[PDB]
Amino acid sequence: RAKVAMSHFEPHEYIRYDLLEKNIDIVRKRLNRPLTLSEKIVYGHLDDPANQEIERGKTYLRLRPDRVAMQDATAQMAMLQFISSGLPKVAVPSTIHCDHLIEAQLGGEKDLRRAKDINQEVYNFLATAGAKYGVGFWRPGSGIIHQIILENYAYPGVLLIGTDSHTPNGGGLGGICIGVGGADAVDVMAGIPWELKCPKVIGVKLTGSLSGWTSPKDVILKVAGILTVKGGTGAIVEYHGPGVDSISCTGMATICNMGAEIGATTSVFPYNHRMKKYLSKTGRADIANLADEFKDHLVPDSGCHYDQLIEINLSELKPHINGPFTPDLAHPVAEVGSVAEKEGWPLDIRVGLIGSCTNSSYEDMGRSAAVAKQALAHGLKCKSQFTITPGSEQIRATIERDGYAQVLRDVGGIVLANACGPCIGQWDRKDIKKGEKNTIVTSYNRNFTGRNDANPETHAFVTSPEIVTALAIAGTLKFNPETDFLTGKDGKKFKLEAPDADELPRAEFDPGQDTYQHPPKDSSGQRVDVSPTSQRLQLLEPFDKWDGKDLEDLQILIKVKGKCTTDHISAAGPWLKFRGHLDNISNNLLIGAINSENRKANSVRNAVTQEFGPVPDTARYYKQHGIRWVVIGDENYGEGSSREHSALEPRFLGGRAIITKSFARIHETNLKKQGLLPLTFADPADYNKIHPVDKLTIQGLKDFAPGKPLTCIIKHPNGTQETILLNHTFNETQIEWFRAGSALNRMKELQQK
Numbered sequence: 001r002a003k004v005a006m007s008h009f010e011p012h013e014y015i016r017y018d019l020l021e022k023n024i025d026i027v028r029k030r031l032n033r034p035l036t037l038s039e040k041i042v043y044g045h046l047d048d049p050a051n052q053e054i055e056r057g058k059t060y061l062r063l064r065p066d067r068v069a070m071q072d073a074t075a076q077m078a079m080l081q082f083i084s085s086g087l088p089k090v091a092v093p094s095t096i097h098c099d100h101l102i103e104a105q106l107g108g109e110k111d112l113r114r115a116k117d118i119n120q121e122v123y124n125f126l127a128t129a130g131a132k133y134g135v136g137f138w139r140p141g142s143g144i145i146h147q148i149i150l151e152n153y154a155y156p157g158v159l160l161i162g163t164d165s166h167t168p169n170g171g172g173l174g175g176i177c178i179g180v181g182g183a184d185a186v187d188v189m190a191g192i193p194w195e196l197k198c199p200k201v202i203g204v205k206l207t208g209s210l211s212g213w214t215s216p217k218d219v220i221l222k223v224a225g226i227l228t229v230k231g232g233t234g235a236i237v238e239y240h241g242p243g244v245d246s247i248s249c250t251g252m253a254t255i256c257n258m259g260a261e262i263g264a265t266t267s268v269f270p271y272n273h274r275m276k277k278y279l280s281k282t283g284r285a286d287i288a289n290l291a292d293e294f295k296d297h298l299v300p301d302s303g304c305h306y307d308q309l310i311e312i313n314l315s316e317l318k319p320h321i322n323g324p325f326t327p328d329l330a331h332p333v334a335e336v337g338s339v340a341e342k343e344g345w346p347l348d349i350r351v352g353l354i355g356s357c358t359n360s361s362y363e364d365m366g367r368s369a370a371v372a373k374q375a376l377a378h379g380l381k382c383k384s385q386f387t388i389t390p391g392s393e394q395i396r397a398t399i400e401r402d403g404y405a406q407v408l409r410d411v412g413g414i415v416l417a418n419a420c421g422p423c424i425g426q427w428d429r430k431d432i433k434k435g436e437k438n439t440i441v442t443s444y445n446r447n448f449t450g451r452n453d454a455n456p457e458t459h460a461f462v463t464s465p466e467i468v469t470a471l472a473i474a475g476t477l478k479f480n481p482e483t484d485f486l487t488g489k490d491g492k493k494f495k496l497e498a499p500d501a502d503e504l505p506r507a508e509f510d511p512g513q514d515t516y517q518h519p520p521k522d523s524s525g526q527r528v529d530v531s532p533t534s535q536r537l538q539l540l541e542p543f544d545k546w547d548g549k550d551l552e553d554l555q556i557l558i559k560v561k562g563k564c565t566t567d568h569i570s571a572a573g574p575w576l577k578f579r580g581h582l583d584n585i586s587n588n589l590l591i592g593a594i595n596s597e598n599r600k601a602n603s604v605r606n607a608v609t610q611e612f613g614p615v616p617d618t619a620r621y622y623k624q625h626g627i628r629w630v631v632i633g634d635e636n637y638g639e640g641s642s643r644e645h646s647a648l649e650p651r652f653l654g655g656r657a658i659i660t661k662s663f664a665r666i667h668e669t670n671l672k673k674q675g676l677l678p679l680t681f682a683d684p685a686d687y688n689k690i691h692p693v694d695k696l697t698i699q700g701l702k703d704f705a706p707g708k709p710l711t712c713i714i715k716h717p718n719g720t721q722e723t724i725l726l727n728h729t730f731n732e733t734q735i736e737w738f739r740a741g742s743a744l745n746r747m748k749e750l751q752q753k
């Protein structure tokens with residue numbers, strides 16, 4: 001067919017739209033109905049299109065992704081599991097991005113130099129493991145994973161998996177890009193079929209066009225408020241309608257990115273002329289030309305069925321700001337000043353932060369510079385502190401060149417390194433004390449308790465970068481940029497003009513400094529060294545195989561009340577230092593979860609000593625004494641980040657099962673991957689029948705089967721017992737992971753030894 005390479009770094013890896021077409025056509029002959037766009041790309045990547053059972057929301061699809069991307073806070077454990085498999089080389093194009101371990105303190109170059117000294121052991125491990133197993137390496141300073149992917153790797157029709165829940169960002173260039181845990185990435189790098197529960201499809205029809213202060217970010221802030229954080233679970237969100245051509249390609253990536261906050265499997269836009277334009281401006285005109293020839297397979301079929309349809313008229317959409325502790329609490333910017341006042345949320349904004357993968361594009365930076373130049377023209381600078389994170393080295397070099405970085409410095413901003421930084425709590429924040437109630441506003445995406453600065457009382461609101469800039473200049477939530485007046489230096493009141501800026505550079509992008517390191521695919525004689533006394537890295541010891549017995553008289557480690565995110569189960573911020581060291585990071589296990597017994601975080605009753613203490617310590621005490629334990633959770637357990645450490649840590653400290661009213665998708669898969677039993681109540685009211693003092697027996701593991709519930713005997717201390725049923729979503733592939741002790745143990749059994 002055409003021999004068009006998948007990226008500039010892999011000249012020999014060709015795009016296979018011929019394969020996609022062939023597979024779409026086998027499947028539509030079977031289904032005889034219109035296919036949505038997500039169905040075309042997902043069913044087009046089936047391992048066996050002729051025999052795969054395809055029912056939305058019910059069957060597990062065996063898929064073949066085109067490539068794997070990893071960022072350095074999850075790559076360490078994905079590669080330590082890959083190193084246990086014993087396989088010599090990755091089977092598909094794979095990259096590591098070093099973006100999560102650079103702490104914001106001094107700004108830009110200074111923080112990057114310091115991170116390279118501090119994290120030398122880890123950057124060394126990842127570069128060497130990358131060279132040995134054939135994984136491309138983007139050096140510290142290169143940029144945030146998802147901006148590097150949109151710029152270099154995402155193309156229409158790709159199926160890409162990434163070990164980061166915001167990998168959906170690539171849906172802005174028409175690909176299916178899905179967040180997974182490190183063990184799922186190992187399947188694909190190992191060459192075995194990846195499984196995904198067949199998604200439902202929510203369609204969002206966009207009408208009208210964006211005007212003025214409304215930006216692409218307001219579309220997904222509104223959609224999150226509508227669907228809530230659990231409304232997208234098990235579905236792909238597919239944007240369509242006449243309003244789509246109104247949105248820039250990075251704008252589409254912003255909307256797909258934050259669909260992670262409603263729990264969606266991913267989000268996608270149809271191939272169109274804005275994407276074509278972006279591909280051509282990023283050196284990939286040949287890929288846009290090939291996608292023009294396969295265009296029919298890159299847009300939805302006429303008359304396809306969505307399981308839910310939502311319509312948003314872009315012309316009536318107004319600026320939004322969401323939070324403070326969930327991203328689906330949505331307020332128009334016009335009313336947040338008055339809701340804050342009523343709810344006792346701090347009105348004064350201490351810090352305004354723009355960037356992150358969600359909103360660090362050239363257009364985002366130009367729109368923020370457009371607000372800032374107006375303030376400068378009246379002799380004002382920011383009242384709040386103001387930070388700017390460029391998404392990649394190319395964007396930093398180009399906004400520097402086109403003058404936007406200097407405008408942002410002149411209003412009072414500090415340009416941080418091209419890294420997550422304050423977004424995952426890598427921020428040496430010193431302006432407030434811990435426990436001090438305060439407000440920050442960001443153009444990020446999640447705003448969960450203590451995530452940006454480890455202070456549980458920081459109230460963080462997420463909005464668009466131009467609204468963060470406008471509010472940073474005013475310094476208060478009681479300021480609506482559309483209606484209110486500022487007072488210049490000269491004494492005149494003035495109003496901010498709605499920002500307008502170019503979506504892409506008129507000239508070409510300036511690539512900035514060299515940061516990609518290609519694997520030697522010759523040599524590969526790298527020894528990966530992990531010192532046995534390292535505090536940051538530790539080789540894995542395999543978990544135990546199942547003993548063949550039912551789980552009786554399980555102790556409840558903690559019955560959690562309410563929202564329990566993976567930042568509650570395994571915090572980030574300072575704990576990122578231990579992401580390659582399982583025993584050391586297990587000391588944060590569940591320290592953020594609220595215990596229903598006393599309403600406290602990190603205080604559970606040790607059943608033997610009758611002392612209340614830290615959750616990690618209690619779990620290690622139970623494990624020392626052979627007491628097997630369980631966690632009882634509420635709705636949407638495991639919401640958020642994909643970090644598989646929230647599943648590896650309970651397995652390591654002797655946990656056996658997590659029984660909840662419902663699970664978020666990626667955490668439930670990670671639990672099964674590590675040999676734990678994620679189970680849900682067949683009747684969610686049974687959560688109220690279990691008290692922290694009860695012992696539980698899970699029976700029926702011997703005839704464990706897809707679709708058959710397990711019986712749980714609740715043993716009350718007074719001698720009463722109650723039997724309840726627990727459902728599970730295991731298929732026979734997954735039951736084999738459980739019986740072997742973990743998916744990696746099963747994979748190693750299949751290696752004939």
Ligand SMILES: O=C([O-])/C=C(\CC(=O)[O-])C(=O)[O-]
Pocket residue numbers: 073074100163164165166423424572640641642643
């Ligand atoms: O490295 C991580 O902890 C996983 C992240 C970053 C985050 O929480 O934003 C994710 O999957 O989203």
Ligand code: SF4
Pocket residue numbers: 144145146164166356357358419420423424444445
């Ligand atoms: S959401 Fe924040 S922490 Fe996660 S990849 Fe994006 S910039 Fe990094």
